[PDB]
Structure formats: C-alpha cells, structure tokens
Design a protein around this ligand. Structure first.
Ligand SMILES: NC(=O)c1ccc[n+]([C@@H]2O[C@H](COP(=O)([O-])OP(=O)(O)OC[C@H]3O[C@@H](n4cnc5c(N)ncnc54)[C@H](O)[C@@H]3O)[C@@H](O)[C@H]2O)c1
Ligand SMILES: NC(=O)c1ccc[n+]([C@@H]2O[C@H](COP(=O)([O-])OP(=O)(O)OC[C@H]3O[C@@H](n4cnc5c(N)ncnc54)[C@H](O)[C@@H]3O)[C@@H](O)[C@H]2O)c1
Ligand SMILES: NC(=O)c1ccc[n+]([C@@H]2O[C@H](COP(=O)([O-])OP(=O)(O)OC[C@H]3O[C@@H](n4cnc5c(N)ncnc54)[C@H](O)[C@@H]3O)[C@@H](O)[C@H]2O)c1
Ligand SMILES: NC(=O)c1ccc[n+]([C@@H]2O[C@H](COP(=O)([O-])OP(=O)(O)OC[C@H]3O[C@@H](n4cnc5c(N)ncnc54)[C@H](O)[C@@H]3O)[C@@H](O)[C@H]2O)c1
Ligand code: NA
Ligand code: NA
Lengths: 392, 392, 392, 392
C-alpha cells in the first residue's frame, strides 16, 4: 500500500518509515503493531505489510533519510544498524512543500520553513498544488495520514465549516481566516477519494463540512489525535474507579518533553489543542468531572522522551480519600509510529470492505475519537475487534 | 441478611461492620459498594442493605466494638463520630472461639489467642462446635465469609482433599495434618447449606472435596482472595500492553504494610500464599511470563496503610524498552470492607436465584478466582454485569 | 515572649498557636522545633518556650480558635483533643484589621475581607493604626512575623524603596502605588524597635530603605520566604551532584495544593513571587543554570496537603544522562508552624545579644535568604550553629 | 600512574578503563571525576590523569576490550565511537587468574570461571602467585583497587584476623576456612608497599591484621564499598530530617538490577554484605534507628541500570506523619567508574604526601568508611576538601 504523510519529516513519521522498512527487510520484530495481533489474522489479504511513502512538509530537508537521521542523532531510539539498513529506501522519499496556514505561533519553533501560502497562492491554488502532489503519488491502495505539528483551536465558522457547500464557498472566496492547514489536507485527500486519518488534535476532517464530504464520496476516515502514552493509561485506569464505585475527586496530568513537538507545544495557542484532548477523556468515562489539571511543558534534555507524572486523588468506602501515582517514561515516536502503520492498514481494509464516513470503531487509536462516546480502552478494543470480525 | 465472619475482630471485618451500620443509620455515603452501582438496580429485592453480624475469632476481645476501636485508634480510617454512632450496635456483636489449625507460624504475631484445638478437641468435635456456633446464628438469609489471617499453602493430599468422601474420611480419622482452619469453616458453612466466600488466599472451599460438597448441597460459593489494591491495578493495566501488542519483560510489585495483616505476612510460610496469588495474574492475562517479582514486607509505621511500588519494564516498536511506575497509597480495610458487603449480597442473590457451586462470575472480587481464566478487570466486570442481568 | 503575626488567622499561624500551647500544656512533643535541637541548649535563657500571640488580619473571624478550627475541619492536621485543650487560650487571641494594599488579584480568593485602605485611610494614617495595634501589644520580648498571603512582585522604585528618606517620603506623599502591605507592616515593626521576620516571598523588609532602617534602629531582622518542603529537599539534594562533579541539565518542580494558600497562588500575579523564590536556588548552589521549571497549581481536594513532584535530569561519566525522581507528600502547615516559633526565639536571642540588621545566619529557615549566597541546606545549618555558638 | 584492578573484566572496571582512555584521547569530558573539581587543582602534580591498567580475574576472556564490549553490547552505556577509539589500548590489557576463595554461592552465576585454588595451591602458594602478578606490573606510582564481586560476610576469627602475626600464621598453616579472596589481594598489595582501596563490601583490608600491616609498612589504604547511588542519596538526604528536628520512623530501600552484579547478589550469602552496608548508614547519621528495610533483587531486563525505590516515613510538628518518595534510575557502572579513577589519584597523592594507614578522609567515596563515624555526605565532602588542603 501507499501512505502520504502530512509532516513527513517529523519523528513519528520518520520512525514509521524506518520501522516499516526494517520489518520488511526482516531485521525487526512486529512488536507494537496492533494490526499484527492474532485477532486480526487475515488483514494481510486486504492490507499486506508493504509500504511506499511520500508526503508534505514545511521543513524542507533533502529527503526522509536525512530527516530520520536528524531525529536519530538526538534520540537514538533505534539501532545505528537499522538506520544504515534502511538508508537507501528512505533517501528515495522526498516530501513536497505543504501549507502552514493558521497553524499558530508555535510553528516559529521549527526553524527554517517554506510554505505554499508564502508563495502568494490563494486557497483554491493551494488546494490544487496539494491535490496535484497527492494524486501524482496515489493509487487505489493509498491512504493520507496527518502527523504534522499540532495546530491551535481553529477560528470556527458555521457557514464555512458547517456544510460542504459552505466549505467550498470558503475556498472559492479565498477566506483564509477560516481555513487551517489540516482542513485543507483532509479536504484534498477526500476530494481525491482517498481514506484519511488525523493523528493530531488539529481539526483535520473533524468538521461537519468534511464529514459530509467523506460520506458523499463514500470514503472512510478516522481520528482524532493518537492515544499513545499518558492518555492511554488514563483511559485504561480511570474505569477501575467506576467499576469499584469510587469517586475520583482530582486527577493531575503533567507532561514534559523536548524535540520539535515539545517546541511547538511550548506556544500557548498550539498547546491548548493537545491539552483539551488529553483532559476531556475523564468525564466521558466517569459521568462526572473530577477536578482535573493537564499540562505540557517544554523540557529540552528529554528530547522525544516524553515523561508524564500523574496523580489521582479518589474517595472510597465511608468517604476516605486515598492516593494513586504514576510515571510514564517512554519515547513518544516509539509508541506512535506503529499506530500510523496500523491506522493505514485498517483504513485500507475499511476502504476495501465498502466502509464510508467516520470509522468510529477505530476509536482505540485516538484521544478524541470522532462520532463516539466510547473512551474506556477496554471497550474500544472490543469495538475494534468486533468491527473487524463483522467485515472480515 | 446475616453475615458470619471468620476473623470477625480483624480490621477488614470490623470496618465492614462499622460501614454497614453507618450506612443504615444514614450517616455515610454508599461509595465503595459495587452492589450499589446502577447496573445492579433491583438487587435490594433479593439482598437489601440490611446486615446482622457474628463470627469466629481466636483473638478474644469482649465484642466487635472494642475490636473496631483498637483498629480505629491506630488507623483513624473513619471519623470518631462514626465510631460513636455505631458503638451500641457493635457492642452486641460477640465472636465465638474458632480454630487456628495449621495456620502457620505467623499466627504467633496476633498476641494472646485461644483456639478450639487448644482445648484438646478432635476434628469431628471441632467441626461440631463450629457448626453449632453458625447454625445457632443462621437463617435462610445467612452467608459465611472468611476474612481471617492468611494461612500458609496447605499440606495437600489427593485422598483427603480430592473428594468429599476423602475429606469426610479425614475428619473421621482425625487426620489433623491435612486439615487447615479455612477448610473446616468452609466445610461447616456448606454442610449447613449456607453460601460461602473466601476473601483470603487460604485454600477455604477451593479444594475438589468442598467444590463437590457445594454442588451436592446446591449451595453457591465464591473466591479466592480479595482483589483490592495493587493487584486490582495490575489486572486493569496489564491488558493495555497486550491490546497494543507490547511485550512486558519485567514487572516488580513491592508492598509494605503494618497492622495484624503485615505482622502475620512477615512470616515466610504465611506470606507465600499472598505472594503467589498476587504474582500469578500476569501470565493468565498476557499468555506468557514476564520476569516478575512480588514481595510483601512488614513496615510497622504504615499500619493498615498498605503502600505498593510497581515498576513495569516493557518493549514496543522495534524492540525499544520503556518504563512505567506506579505507587498505590491506600488503606487496605477501606478498599476491602465494601467488597465483603457486596460479596454477601451477591451470594444471597445467587442463592435465591437457584445458583449452586462456584459462582465463577464473581471473579471480579478476587485475585485467584475459582473455576475461571478471566483475570482482566474489564472482562471480569462485564462477566459480573452480564451474570446479574441473566438472573435478575 | 510575644509574637505579633501578620496573617494571624492563616493555617501556618493558627497551627503555630495550637502547637505552642499544646507544648506548654505538656500534651505534645517538641518535634519539629529547630530551636530544641541539642546544639541550641541554653537558648531558653534568652527565649524560653513561652508565647503570647496577637496579629493583623483581613479575614475577620471572631478569634484565633474559630480560625484554627476552620483549618482543622478541612485538614485534621492535629488531634481533636489538642484542639479542645487549647480552645480557651486561642479564643483570647483576637486579630486586628490590617491592610491588603497592593497584594494582588489572588486576595479575592480569601472571600469576605475588611481592610484599613477600604476605610479611606492614607499611608500615614494606615501606618499609625498598624503601629498603634502593635505597640499596644508589644513589650521588650516582642517579635513581629509576616505569615500573610503571598503578594505579587512590587512596583519597584529607586526613590521610594532605595533609602529610608525615600520610603518616608513615600508615606508622606501618600504614594500608594509604590507601597505594599508587607512593606508597611515591616516598616511599623522596625520603627517600633521590634525584631521582624518575613516567612513569605513578599518584599517585606527586603528593600534597601527598610534594611537601612533596621540598622539605624539597631534591630535584628530575617527572611525571606519559609523553606519547608520541596525547596528544602532541593537545597539538600542539589549539592550532591556538585560534590560528585555531575552536570544537572534539567530540574522540574511541580506543586499542587488547595486551601487558602493554593487559592491565592492560583492567581498569576501572586504566584510569580512564590515561583521565582522556589526556582532561583539552583544556580546559587551549582554555579550554572540547568533548564528549570517550577509550577504551583491549585488542586482543591489536597487542601493544605501540598504535594510536590520533582524530576532531575543529570549527566555523569562520559556524558551519560541519568534520572532522579521525588515526591513530597506533606502538610504545609505542619512543616511551617514550628519554624515560626523557632524564628521568633532566634530573633529574641539575636535582639538580646545586640545583633542588628539582617541576621543573614538565619538563612537556614528561608528560600530567599537576605544578604547571603549560602543556599546549600548543610552549609546553612553549620552557619546557624556557628552563629549561635559565637553569641551564646 | 598504574592501577591493578581486582575483578578487571567487570563492568565498573572496564568502564573506568574505557573512560580513562577516552578522556586521555580527548574525546570525552571530565564529568563525574571528583578529582577534577576546582578544589583539587594541583592534584595533577602528584597524580596526573594518566593510567595504565592490569588486574586479576576469574572469568578469563582474552583481554579487557572483549570484556568491555560484552558489557557494552548489553548496556550501551557509552557510544560505539568511544568503544572503537579505545579498542587498541584495551586489547593490550590482559588479566591474570586470581582466587575466588570463600566468595560465596553467588560466584556460580558468573558462568565459566578458573581460579588459583582450583589448581590445588595452598594459601602461601596463592599469595606468591598474586604477589608475583602484581609486582611484575607495579612501579612507585601503582595502586591496587578491589572491584570484584561482593563476597559474603567472612568466617571471622580473632586469632587469624585480629593481628598481623595471627593472619600470617593463617597463611603459614593453610587455614583456608578463614581466608577470603579479598583479604588475600589486600594482604598482597600492602606486603608489596602498594596503596589499596576496596570498592566493595567484602572485608578486604578492613580487618585489624591488615590495618596493622598497612601502618607498619607506612602504606595508605581506603574503603569500604563504593557509595554511588541510592546510598549517596540516603546520606545526603537523611541529615535534612535531623537538621529540622524531625523523627524518621521508617525508611524503605528497594533495589532492582541485572547484569553480573545483580546475578551474584541474587545469592542470599553474597547479598547480606551489600544489604548491611546500605542499611546501617541511618543510625550513624541520626543517632537512632528508624525501622529500616533494605533489599536488592535480581531483575534481569534492567541489566546494569540499577533502579532504586525509597520511601521515607517521618514525623514532624505535633507528631504528624508525612511521607517522602524517591526513584533513582541510573547506570551503576557510570556512577562508579569515575570514583575508581578518583580513588586511585587520591591514594597516589596520599602516598606521596607520606600518608599511612586508613585514609579515613576518603570516607566520601564509601558506604562503610573505615575508621570514621562521618557518614553525612556534606560532612564527608568538607573532610575530603580539608584533608587535601592540609597536605597540598
Ligand atoms: N506519541 C506521540 O509522539 C504523539 C501522540 C499523539 C499526537 N501526536 C502528534 O503527532 C504530531 C507529530 O509528532 P512528532 O513528534 O512527529 O512531531 P515533529 O515536530 O517531530 O513532527 C511534525 C512534522 O510536521 C511538520 N509540520 C508542521 N506543520 C506542518 C504543516 N502544516 N504541513 C506539513 N508539515 C508540517 C514539522 O516540520 C515536523 O517535521 C504532533 O502534532 C503531535 O502532537 C504525537
Ligand atoms: N485489602 C485488604 O485488607 C485485603 C485484600 C486481600 C486479602 N486480604 C486478607 O484478608 C484477611 C483480613 O485482613 P485484615 O487486614 O482484616 O487482617 P487482621 O489481622 O486485622 O484480621 C484477621 C483477623 O482474623 C483473626 N484470625 C486469624 N486466624 C483465624 C482463625 N483461623 N480463625 C478465626 N480468626 C482468625 C485474627 O485474630 C484477626 O482479628 C487477611 O488474610 C488478608 O491477607 C485483605
Ligand atoms: N509550608 C508552608 O505552608 C509555607 C512555606 C513557605 C511560605 N509560605 C507562605 O506563608 C504564608 C501563609 O501560608 P498559609 O498556608 O498559612 O496561608 P493562609 O492563607 O491559610 O494564611 C494567610 C492568612 O493571611 C491573611 N492575609 C492575606 N493578606 C493579608 C494582609 N495583607 N494582612 C493581614 N492578613 C492577610 C489571610 O486572610 C489568611 O488568613 C503564605 O504566603 C505562603 O505562601 C507557606
Ligand atoms: N555503582 C556500582 O556499580 C557499585 C557500587 C558499590 C559497590 N559495587 C561493587 O563493585 C563490584 C563490581 O561491580 P560490577 O558491576 O563491575 O560487577 P561485575 O560482576 O560486572 O564485575 C565484577 C568482576 O569481578 C570478577 N570477580 C568476582 N570475584 C572475583 C575474584 N575473587 N577475583 C577476581 N575477579 C573476581 C567477576 O568475574 C567480574 O568480572 C561488585 O562487588 C559491586 O557490588 C558496585
Ligand atoms: Na502519599
Ligand atoms: Na525512568
């Protein structure tokens, strides 16, 4: 299959590329791949473990190898021998110039960038470039996945975001104020009939306009925002207090990281998207709102080793308060990268099975799953299992 | 209903007694009670929140109030005002002298004790005293629950434990070497046609002899070993690594506590029962065995504030190792006490619904659930929900 | 001796009052009191353990007992029996209306308040009321200690803060914009010839004007900002990396608390004072600046149980990065309250020994010690010991 | 200078060798080296940063490079580029066959071993081989340092360990039952007039016989047992509670590690030496004994990444209990290796300054410092500083 990655030179993106190729060359295990679990036996009939890559970027380096090595230098999150073995393949992946339209002040932290809007192009002309890039790459086994820096919350508009006609009016009128990069890539993917997933908390396809578009075009889509670490634990663990009829009175979630993701989320406007997505899961699972605090702070020496500190304050029998702590110490690109490969395969599977619109049953992958109040990790896993069985 | 508690002066036992009465007098919330969750609406048709108590003990204090206050003095795990309000009721609960037969060297740590076997009685004569105590108390709405100190692993015997005839032969021949206290209380309960649950990792009714007996008598029973804290988290959290196709390579579980439970488990023979029950859950959930260490150590200043330290070492994409820590800081009697009330109500419900033999669907309460490989907390909760719906 | 407490109805203040009296009535140990350590034998010649209290407040409750009980209800940080035993004594402590001039937006969180500036008084007239209150209480064995809510960083002024003449000009001209409450109480104390200590990060006497005043008047003073918990650990532990020639690359300090202190510090202007005081210690000890983040967030269920989460990222041999975590779980009023009693006794001792100006050797008590670059806890303790020996 | 390392193929030993050479070739910083701190300016007059290595082993691999690479493969605790750069130098370091006499059951975990006692040699003949090996290597700038696996507590003997004549009688009579390997290497070093340090909790030179010998020979020696991680923190942090007049009621110290050190300490007899050395520090600092538990458990996936979990339970004002947690996550060979280089330089310095007998002022390096009750890390550092200034 083929995967077009928005933010193709990022660490999540390059590590998926490194991993896919290491696994194909037979020099890496299949650990981390949800699509490789026993329940999904037979997926390879529809989506074999076979990947060609391209994508859009605003940080233009020569190729995906140079991009992968920049992240490897700082993080060393896989062996030098894996880097070397996949060098050839990754040198042939060259990203195209994308758009950073309305992606917030945090984009400044990426350093030297070049964008379509910087060239003076209108919305219609930007869409045409994005579509031409994708369609020149795409086949009938192609998916588009957004793994680009997290945008701020969009300037929402009922007219421009509430219907497909309103959104196409937005493009026609060149109303840039209401367009964000993530919307434009999602729009392009679906207009081309390509399945789409948004691994970030940027709006992407999660506006009514684009949900209408995906349905009309009969195209499957999924999102939003990869559930990889702290939020994974929160949605696995919060149900335990509910099952035991305990009241959660407080939940603290504090996250420190560096690298480009920590750099972008250092900006208050970009951060808000990620923070709300991490925070809001609690009420959906419990039925009520514990006092919750969720923060992300830049902490440069950790690079992509995002570390989370959580504290849960809870009541039990007779009103007695009790306390639970956790620390997650993990590399973000290592828990994220396989989910990109899994999302791509499950979208391809969904496409071939005639699935259209939001694939709500892929909620398991996401912190803010579209079209569903199923948040509990256990419930989401059962939904994913049962969905695949129903269509297999 | 009526509940006969083996180990009636213990902290789990007295706090269930304090709690039941506080809730009946309308001075405490219903927090902590699984049987009070919305899904179990209508349980009160079969098992209303209404409790009379008695039980067996080897530490003879005057009454359950004096017992409750001894634990309250050291722990202050509920308000002085709750203690005062329930004093009358608890002063009327007087335990009967039980048996500490083959309950290990840790029983020495309980201080001043008096037992049936100390009086020179044979197995048959001990059984008669235990039965007379229970039957003088029991009605058609009576359950027996074991919350006594954890025994060592029994001297197992195919002849004496493998069939009811073999076990009754054991009693007839006065073969004390193969009898443990917990077996004798379980035997007595079931011979009397009373539902039974074992909240400890002592063998109790979990031998083939007594499982045969419960079936023959048409009596429901449940166990073993309350899942309250660290093991609750382990069975909620370990599935997350499986769902995400990660390999757990190591899991460390270190527990410190004081009070009478920490005192008994300071002995190496008593400890082994609790340790194996906490440790063995991992393989059943994952399909394989991470290097696991599970310890319990005495740490007197914590009293009944059992604190657990866990560390999970796990592999993800490309073989990368990553790390997860947790600390549970809770009072053991507060997470355990409501489960005693819930177990009693669900046993009464099961009894009235014609349920007989091991109620395997009550696995949710237990670290070592009888007759089931369902260990995942989420799965167990669904099984409990669905079981109750099926019989309601 | 006599202690006039600014913020007399606060939890630190009332717990010092509760503690002093419990210890005098012989119903509490002397644990927590630095002045009770063997090295300080003979202090009781100059400052016996004997305390009468008064102070200023803006939250007017009837008396210090009602104030103490309000905090006890929420926190239960000492026994009901201690509360009862000291009720009489504390009912006779009645605070006087003080000033909340330029104490930031966080003061709004205190609820119902009444202030001198609210009555329409000028700076000169406010100073006269504050002085009249203190002088009506004071004797030759009286000290004034600031334990009031943390102010924002002041609008600094060279003219008005840089010399005593400039500060007295400020009062004469009624230039309120440059006066803060803490400055006015410190000014009043020193004008009256009374020793002064500032337990908060508010400016207090730590401006050149008031340092000049204390010297001229021959009056000892000490501050700023009680070092009680997280910062205590930081100044004990950071030296270990220096002694071992390790580079600290990052230090994260995250603090959650409730109660009135957490409420006031929820405001961004008030918070800044506390944050800088906690953060700045690192460079002074190490000679360089690790990337440091220090936050305080409101977390209401913890009440006065301030909990801190720290993470230290450090380099050792060959550049290898390594990691250290800590969690402090303590009640803030319990670690602070004895230091108020100790500060008072050491100020009285200093006064009687002819000490004047900043008592820099009391740095041990403080996060931002005036007139000293001695920050290491070990060094500060030796300085305090040696100071007392020199004057004994 | 020259350093003869007992246990020369171990990870602490090989990493000191790797580090020394990387630093000499100018490809590594001097981070981690206490002897490189500003206070020790001028040490290079007596002990320049210049090292030639040899030693004894029982695991015979071809050379120290092969040994270093075996540990590097599993741990990756320095760059492949450092490994490559020092390969030549380390290939020329070839260990000689030593003795594992009475080194406990844990020695079995080292795999394929060869020893002097296995050849049938008497004590006198073993001593001669050990001496011949060392003297063939040694010059006037040579030190011997023990970094071999931790032995069990020795079979102590007043006659054989209490005087030099008694110890030499032991050798003469071939009384193996009372000799341990570490004693024999220490004996040989001192008989040869070479300074000696013991980085392990094995007895080494810490018996009266060998202390008498070092004095008579006018030879400086130091030990015992490198203070590198958890115990470093404990001796830095415990003084904080004393300075603040708090009572420590409980201290838990739980350590997990793998590699060869974790393997040897998995044995109960070997473990006891390390456990007592880690545990006993508390009383010496505080004056009393908190309930303390100290454990080390094998946890193979961590390899040389020893992780420690500590919990401190402490009383403060009015008897209130409060709680402090810490987690140390570090590589043991990285914190240990520079101390070997520092110990060697400070021993050479001591030798040239006419120092003889136990260098008690090197206590800073050690968990069980010989001839001193100075345990507090801060105090030890001041003692080391002042010692060096006095002799410089
Ligand atoms: N576990 C995880 O790492 C995880 C989990 C959930 C969500 N996410 C989200 O995934 C995204 C990727 O994470 P990452 O660590 O790879 O960050 P990264 O910064 O290393 O990668 C993002 C890449 O996208 C590029 N980019 C930014 N805006 C773009 C635009 N509009 N068009 C094209 N390219 C653009 C950047 O130049 C960068 O190379 C982030 O938004 C992050 O918040 C990551
Ligand atoms: N969260 C929890 O507290 C928890 C969880 C799982 C299992 N358990 C188990 O529940 C049991 C009770 O815990 P606890 O904290 O109340 O301990 P406890 O020691 O305070 O209570 C046990 C009581 O039973 C008595 N006893 C011991 N052997 C007896 C015998 N053979 N016959 C009659 N009485 C006997 C003791 O005197 C004591 O009063 C223990 O076995 C414990 O391991 C507790
Ligand atoms: N361990 C600790 O608790 C600790 C450590 C260091 C510093 N501090 C500082 O000590 C102070 C007291 O802490 P607390 O927990 O008692 O808080 P608290 O809010 O319970 O006490 C402060 C009291 O002062 C009053 N107040 C505020 N402004 C005033 C003014 N200008 N004049 C007179 N009264 C005023 C408030 O009404 C309140 O009763 C805070 O500034 C805090 O940041 C506390
Ligand atoms: N931070 C630390 O790593 C640290 C701190 C304090 C003490 N120590 C102690 O230092 C020692 C070395 O630690 P390591 O991690 O290098 O362990 P290691 O097992 O990797 O090294 C010990 C080496 O000595 C060898 N050996 C064992 N007995 C011997 C004998 N009698 N004669 C000659 N060689 C012998 C072994 O074969 C091995 O190569 C251990 O005793 C350990 O407990 C280490
Ligand atoms: Na805690
Ligand atoms: Na870690």
């Amino acid at each position: 299959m083929k995967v077009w990655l928005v933010g193709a030179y990022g660490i999540v993106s390059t590590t998926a590329m490194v991993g896919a190729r290491a696994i194909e060359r037979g020099i890496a295990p299949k650990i981390g791949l949800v699509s490789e679990l026993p329940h999904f036996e037979g997926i390879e009939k529809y989506a074999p473990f076979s990947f060609e890559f391209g994508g859009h970027e605003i940080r233009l380096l020569s190729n995906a190898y140079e991009a992968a090595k920049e992240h490897w230098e700082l993080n060393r999150h896989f062996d030098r021998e894996i880097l070397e073995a996949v060098k050839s393949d990754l040198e042939g992946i060259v990203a195209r110039k994308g758009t950073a339209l309305n992606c917030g002040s945090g984009i400044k932290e990426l350093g030297d960038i070049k964008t379509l809007e910087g060239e003076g192009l209108s919305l219609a002309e930007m869409v045409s470039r994005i579509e031409e890039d994708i369609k020149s790459f795409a086949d009938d086994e192609t998916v588009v996945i957004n793994v680009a820096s997290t945008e701020p919350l969009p300037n929402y508009s009922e007219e421009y975001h509430g219907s497909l006609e309103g959104f196409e009016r937005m493009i026609d009128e060149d109303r840039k104020e209401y367009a964000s990069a993530s919307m434009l890539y999602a729009y392009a993917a679906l207009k081309l009939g390509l399945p789409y997933a948004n691994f970030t908390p940027s709006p992407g396809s999660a506006i009514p306009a684009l949900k209408e578009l995906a349905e009309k075009k009969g195209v499957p889509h999924a999102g939003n925002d990869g559930k990889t670490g702290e939020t994974l634990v929160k949605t696995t663990l919060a149900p335990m207090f509910a099952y035991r009829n305990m009241e959660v009175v407080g939940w603290m979630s504090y996250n420190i990281l560096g690298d480009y993701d920590g750099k972008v989320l250092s900006a208050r406007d970009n951060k808000e998207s990620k923070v709300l997505s991490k925070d809001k899961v609690l009420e959906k699972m419990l039925g009520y709102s514990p006092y919750s605090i969720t923060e992300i702070q830049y902490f440069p020496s950790l690079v992509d080793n995002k570390t989370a500190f959580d504290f849960v304050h809870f009541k039990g029998f007779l009103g007695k308060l009790m306390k639970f702590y956790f620390i997650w110490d993990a590399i973000d690109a290592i828990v994220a990268a396989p989910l990109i490969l899994d999302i791509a395969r499950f979208l391809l599977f969904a496409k071939k099975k005639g699935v259209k619109g939001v694939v709500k049953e892929m909620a398991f992958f996401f912190k803010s799953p579209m079209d569903t109040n199923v948040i509990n990790t256990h419930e989401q896993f059962v939904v994913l299992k049962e969905w695949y069985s129903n269509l297999k």
